[PDB]
Amino acid sequence: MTDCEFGYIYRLAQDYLQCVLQIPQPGSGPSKTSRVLQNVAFSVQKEVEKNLKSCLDNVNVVSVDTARTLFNQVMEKEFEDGIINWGRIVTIFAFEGILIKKLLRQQIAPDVDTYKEISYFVAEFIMNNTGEWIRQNGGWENGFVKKFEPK
């Protein structure tokens, strides 16, 4: 239902993970909303990775649990001043992209059925901590897309 509920947000986090992993699904392709988010979130992830080269080469992400704990430290720090904006929501997807790259390279017991887990808790955080703001600011089609679509 609607674009601020779990299903829509899970589909966005899923698409972003398939983009980072280089495994887009075959079948009509992603939505306009997803295509704009992928382009802008990836540009941010590239910057975050450069800006944290030492910090990222220190932690090891061997499991879904460890990735959730690391994502929790990030979200707490990112929103420690209490303010929500589109740039910070874009930053959530950039961090899920970095976490799935480290999990693919460091998951002690690999499992291709664990990218869906990361997407799940990312959508869980977005809906429970930013879902009200998103809907009150136009949602994804009249909020996110209008602000970040090509001019």
Ligand SMILES: */C=C\C(=O)N(Cc1ccc(Cl)cc1)c1ccc(O[C@@H]2CC[C@@H](N)C2)cc1
């Ligand atoms: C450098 C390790 C550290 O303290 N972490 C843990 C960490 C490392 C790698 C990933 Cl990916 C996820 C978590 C850490 C690093 C950055 C954090 O923050 C971000 C930078 C500022 C804020 N906007 C997000 C939080 C924790």
